[PDB]
Structure 1
Amino acid sequence: EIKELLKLGDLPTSGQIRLYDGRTGEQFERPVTVGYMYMLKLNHLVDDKMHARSTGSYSLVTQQPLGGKAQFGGQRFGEMEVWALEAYGAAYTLQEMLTVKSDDVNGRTKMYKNIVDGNHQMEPGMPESFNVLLKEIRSLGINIELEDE
């Protein structure tokens, strides 16, 4: 029936026609299926999804960057990302992920100033999340502490 309707419109019954390349005018070597398809634009626009952050607001308890495009948050570098960094042996990249790009308050300030100064060097410190963990364990009536140097 489709081929009959194609015949009625004086169109090839195979549904394939000869196409030419607009760039060169050269004929494409084989017949190309050309027709009409009903296409939908889904509610997944790149306008709503594109997001980037250099610096911004940080969480209250942990000093890590906020989450979500609506909050201008940073991307989460989760456990498997850390596993990938460990498998590469990229220890400095991992350290800057953990400290100067996250809850190392002093480290991130020094990093920003150094980048403005043109000195691409970090001075990482203790992430605040570790201190929060220590305080939480201490609140459970457990004495956890760091030893000497």
Structure 2
Amino acid sequence: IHARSTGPYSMITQQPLGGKAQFGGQRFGEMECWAMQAYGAAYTLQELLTIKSDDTVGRVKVYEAIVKGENIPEPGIPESFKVLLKELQSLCLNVEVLSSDGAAIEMR
């Protein structure tokens, strides 16, 4: 048996830990994402893979929004994507996300 609404996070990764000792979360694998996508539940999966795991503003904002009893904020900037963008830019690959029409942007 193991449960976690929120708790103490890891320093290295920014997703909840594994195990009952550290009061960890529970692992949401690829095969769960496959099934979420087979349902076609974009919002559930995109909630699971952003605020429920990674996003540092996201988790505190959603906790705050839940305890206040307000609308859940739209999860914007996952830590994984920042990590991969910075990591790709570290290997000297210039990656810039263009819009449908107009000029490109930084995430923040």
TM-score grouping bracket, smaller chain normalisation: 0.7 to 0.9
Q: TM-score scaled by structure 1? A: 0.61
RMSD: 1.6
Aligned twin of 1:114: 65
Question: Match of 2:74, SS?
Answer: coil
Aligned partners of 1:62 and 1:134: how far apart in 2? 15
Deviations 1:4-62 (A, max 9, x none): xxxxxxxxxxxxxxxxxxxxxxxxxxxxxxxxxxxxxxxxxxxxxx1101111222233
Show structure 1 runs of 4+ deviating over 4 A: none
Residues 62 and 132 of structure 1 are in contact (CA less than 8 Å); yes or no, is this contact kept in structure 2? no
1:16-95 paired onto structure 2 within 5 Å: 50-95=1-46
Which letter does structure 2 place at the counterpart of 1:135?
Answer: K
Residues 100 and 124 of structure 1 are in contact (CA less than 8 Å); yes or no, is this contact kept in structure 2? yes
Question: Any unmatched runs of 5+ in structure 1?
Answer: 1-49
State the percentage of identical aligned residues: 69
Residues 106 and 125 of structure 1 are in contact (CA less than 8 Å); yes or no, is this contact kept in structure 2? no
Aligned twin of 1:19: none
Aligned twin of 2:48: 97
Deviations 1:99-128 (A, max 9, x none): 110111111111111111223523212111
Aligned partners of 2:51 and 2:4: how far apart in 1? 14
Higher relative contact order (CA 8 A, sep 6+): 2
Aligned partners of 1:61 and 1:111: how far apart in 2? 22
Q: Greater strand share, 1 or 2?
A: 1
